[PDB]
């Protein structure tokens, strides 16, 4: 079966695709993983990307599309971790997979209130003198040891990058609520929980 994961950055839904793929026997994919190494190898498709990273284009989606369609595993059982991005991906991404006679079965969508992320990823703290993080929080670093806030995890900014998740967000999961296989996650909650209505609903 084939199953999409999203959820903006906070989360945690990482942490419930590698979990699920280690019981169930699903091969884990991110469209990153995919995209650098084919770059790296220098296949015919990795050096087409490549010229368009260079120029400081975006990747074009059919090639995105390429690249996965290239290993992608026979028996079909796969996780989409964060990908599809946008509407279009989402329409091309269908195309491709019902040209081996294969769908999307489920779309888990992992929400989590706009409070909660600002609290988890604003409260990081950065080590500079060796990049280990921390967390005022969860993790508090030794009284004394040097820790800064990067730029971006500044409340302010976070509530803007929510806000750009949304934007484009909204569209894709309007179109697989219209084909009644969006499945709603409530990711506030413990992480045995969030894992619970994850089985529940495969």
């Given at each position: ?6 959820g903006?950055?906070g989360a945690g839904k990482?942490?419930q ?92 969508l992992f929400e989590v209130?706009?409070?909660v ?68 996650i409530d990711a506030s909650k413990?992480?045995?929980?969030v894992?619970?209505q ?5």
């Amino acid at each position: 079966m084939i199953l999409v994961f999203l959820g903006p950055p906070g989360a945690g839904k990482g942490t419930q695709a590698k979990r699920l793929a280690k019981e169930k026997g699903f091969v884990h994919i991110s469209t990153g993983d995919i995209l650098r190494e084919a770059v790296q190898k220098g296949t015919p498709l990795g050096k087409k990307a490549k010229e368009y990273m260079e120029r400081g284009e975006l990747v074009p989606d059919d090639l995105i599309i390429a690249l996965i369609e290239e290993v992608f595993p026979k028996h079909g059982n796969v996780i989409f971790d964060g990908f599809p991005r946008t509407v279009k991906q989402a329409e091309a991404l269908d195309e491709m997979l019902e040209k081996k006679g294969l769908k999307v079965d489920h779309v888990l969508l992992f929400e989590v209130p706009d409070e909660v992320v600002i609290e988890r990823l604003s409260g990081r703290r950065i080590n500079p003198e060796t990049g280990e993080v921390y967390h005022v929080k969860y993790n508090p670093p030794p009284p004394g040891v040097k820790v800064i806030q990067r730029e971006d995890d500044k409340p302010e900014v976070i509530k803007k990058r929510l806000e750009v998740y949304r934007e484009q967000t909204a569209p894709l999961i309007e179109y697989y609520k219209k084909k009644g296989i969006l499945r709603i996650i409530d990711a506030s909650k413990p992480v045995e929980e969030v894992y619970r209505q994850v089985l529940e609903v495969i």
